[PDB]
Paper text:
We have determined the crystal structure of the MATα1 [name] mutant at 2.85 Å resolution. The crystal belonged to space group C2, with 42% solvent content. Chain B contains three invisible regions, the N-terminus (Met1–Glu15), the gating loop (Asp116–Glu127) and the Phe250–Gly257 region, while chain A contains an ordered gating loop and the Phe250–Gly257 region shows a clear electron-density map. Chains A and B align well, with an r.m.s.d. of 0.076 Å, and are almost identical, despite some differences in regional flexibility. In contrast, the crystal structure of the [name] mutant of MATα1 described in the present study shows a huge difference in the dimer-interface orientation owing to the substitution of Arg264 in the central part of the dimer by His. The upper part of the mutation site becomes generally tighter (Thr262–Gly263) along the dimer interface, while the mutation site itself loosens. The dimer interface of [name] is associated with 25 hydrogen bonds and nine salt-bridge interactions, while only 18 hydrogen bonds and four salt bridges are observed at the wild-type dimer interface. All attempts to obtain a holo structure of the MATα1 [name] mutant failed and produced crystal structures of the apo form, despite the [name] mutant protein being mixed with substrates (methionine and AMP-PNP) prior to crystallization. The loss of enzymatic activity caused by this mutation may thus originate from its inability to bind the substrates in the first place, resulting from the change in the positions of the residues at the dimer interface, which is further compromised by causing a lower affinity for a tetrameric assembly and a greater propensity for dimeric assembly. Arg264 is also involved in providing enzyme stability by forming a salt bridge with Glu57; its mutation to histidine thus causes lower enzyme stability, as observed by the decreased melting temperature of the mutant.
MAT enzymes (EC 2.5.1.6) catalyse the formation of S-adenosyl-l-methionine (SAMe) from methionine (Met) and adenosine triphosphate (ATP). MATα1 is a liver-specific enzyme that is mainly found in mature hepato­cytes, while MATα2 is expressed in extrahepatic tissues including kidney, brain and heart and also in developing liver cells. The catalytic MAT isoforms are biologically active only when they assemble as a dimer or a tetramer, as the functional active sites are formed at the dimer interface. SAMe is the principal methyl donor in the transmethylation processes of important cellular biomolecules, including DNA, RNA, proteins, neurotransmitters etc..
Numbering used by the authors:
A (entry chain A): 14 to 395
B (entry chain B): 16 to 95, 99 to 114, 128 to 249, 257 to 395
Write the structure that this text describes.
């Protein structure tokens, strides 16, 4: 075990402006899929000072109360009393969504069996896994997610009632190399900025942050006397969320995925239905990456897949195992070709992607949570 | 070892890139009058409507309508998108050396000695394909071309002790918007001869290369910060989440990422390595970086731990020093908003620092 190195990931809570827009975008997606499971949705949410704008394209036989969808999401996030900084009742909802609803045609809509239909766009997608945690994800991002989930739970239970939904966490971890695999040694640095009420002091918060959040989240084996704790380091932070800075769907794509580990091909997931390869292939690529680690073929893998618009079969598939694989990456390509079919139409069938389960992906990461079908690994015939 | 790798790129007329260009055009307009103007301008576009949203703090007075419409005109949209009939909703809120970072975040710098500009060939070719089509459109040599294009280049590599060397072109994809008065076969032939042959070196091309040209068979919502991989390295290296366009130099998502590239390119150009990934991270209100990490893919002679000492002695990566070194108060950001932020020697972060090692 030769070289020590540091690595940092960040994460944000449900009340961060960008993540509000991700959650609303997928809440809109779920609303359509509950009524029309083949609804084509591309819904970009922007938010600023008690205003929400929905923008993009929809083609659905559903009828959605966008005002209610938006306002429920914001209420659920925690901006339900104005005492928490904002009101979900006073929120402006401008809907600028180009809408169609399928017109009964003499021609059939799909001329193909849906599994053989060509990819809706081009693009690059990445799947990554690492056997350092049980959920096959980097500890840096998993801890950054769990810190936000911890604060959310303590907020909703009233145990720290001064908490407001807008939070941001960053965890730097100290690693050791092990023939291309990576093993967590200690916690280098932790940062937590979080929105608060007026009736609490910085010292109360910082102490409450260390004891009731960090100690509950991070295993004590990883925590040290030399760990740095930058807690509420910006100073005061009362006004945030919708009332704060401008939020947009697709500005937290690294937080959504792997926190710097592996790679990314550009695609924002939230707002987009399952016929968009930016989402479906990326979910499938994770599925492949996690399956290869869970089978014991490797300890750490980065998978790339690419498409062309109108072509069903992937253009290229690449495997990078950081030398932790026993077999060659070329050999492992054969294993993936024989155990998986990565055409978009087969990807939806395998992963059950017509279900309205997307709002839950819009915070705390799209990967690492076994509740989603792409996190349950496939047993491989190798 | 052999392996494949794919990068994509989009043209000036792609909805997302329109919004990136407008966002930085707005940034430049402010910096021409107030060089310390704080700008965070998110542009959304759909069907002849443009919405600007976010925060500004500037003593400049900007004709946002003119800034937006000139940008769209310059991209190539004269008539149906149209710059003359274009709605401009402006919803931008106004407020009011060892300074702390304006936010937290992760940033990555990456370089590779496969091309002269120290970038992956996959992304560089994908960029040049779009730049080629733009030039042929504006000169009238292919007047059927319209500004919205998308290119994807898959390249076949060979490993060389952690460095990567391009062997051949596996696949090329080009989708591009067009006029009604031209046939698919004319376009596809014109795509291969006048674009691809002019862009890609013939040594890399062979008769077993796949050409998916206009494969969709002859406008959607655009947003700033939806082309961040196209903006950077095309899948190679890594990304920390930050969208560059619309944000001024006091935002670390942009300034640190530009500085991290500068470090990454300097280490390759000095001959300390052939390929490197650098990570830097910050905390809000702290000037000095929290962590700095070096990953050389085993192409480095020195240890990555040793190379950390080289970077510590040759660079100061506090945001306030980063702006001074890289001259980031200049209005040069609209040019970064298409064709990649990295690989172009015209920008100060692409000129490498000679290292005392």
């Amino acid at each position: 075990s030769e070289g020590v190195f540091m690595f940092t990931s960040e994460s944000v809570g449900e009340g961060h402006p960008d993540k509000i827009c991700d959650q609303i975008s997928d809440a809109v997606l779920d609303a359509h899929l509950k009524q029309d499971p083949n609804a084509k949705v591309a819904c970009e949410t922007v938010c600023k000072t008690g205003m929400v704008l929905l923008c993009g394209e929809i083609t659905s036989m559903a009828m959605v109360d966008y005002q209610r969808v938006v306002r429920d999401t914001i209420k659920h996030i925690g901006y339900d009393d104005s005492a928490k900084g904002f009101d979900f009742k006073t929120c402006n909802v401008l809907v600028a969504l180009e809408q169609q609803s399928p017109d009964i045609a003499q021609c059939v809509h799909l001329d193909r069996n849906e599994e053989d239909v060509g990819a809706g766009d081009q693009g690059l997608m990445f799947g990554y896994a690492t056997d350092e945690t049980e959920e096959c994800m980097p500890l840096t991002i998993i801890l950054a997610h769990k810190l936000n989930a911890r604060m959310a739970d303590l907020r909703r239970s009233g145990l720290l009632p001064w908490l407001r939904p807008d939070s941001k966490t960053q965890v730097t971890v100290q690693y050791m190399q092990d023939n291309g695999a990576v093993i967590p040694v200690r916690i280098h640095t932790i940062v937590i900025s979080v929105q608060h009420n007026e009736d609490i002091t910085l010292e109360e918060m910082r102490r409450a942050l260390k004891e009731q959040v960090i100690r509950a989240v991070v295993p004590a084996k990883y925590l040290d006397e030399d760990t740095v704790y930058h807690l509420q380091p910006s100073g005061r932070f009362v006004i945030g969320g919708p009332q704060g800075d401008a939020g947009v769907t697709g500005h937290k794509i690294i937080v959504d995925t792997y926190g710097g580990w592996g790679a990314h091909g550009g695609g924002a997931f939230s707002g987009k239905d399952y016929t968009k390869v930016d989402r479906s292939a990326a979910y499938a690529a994770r599925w492949v990456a996690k399956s290869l680690v869970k089978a014991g073929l490797c300890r750490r893998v980065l998978v790339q897949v690419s498409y062309a618009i109108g072509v069903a079969e992937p253009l290229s598939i690449s495997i990078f195992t950081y030398g932790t694989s026993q077999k060659t990456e070329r050999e492992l390509l054969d294993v993936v070709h024989k155990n998986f079919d990565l055409r978009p139409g087969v990807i939806v069938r395998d992963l059950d992607l017509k279900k309205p389960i997307y709002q839950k992906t819009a915070c705390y990461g799209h990967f690492g949570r076994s509740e989603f079908p792409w996190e349950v690994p496939r047993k491989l015939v190798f």
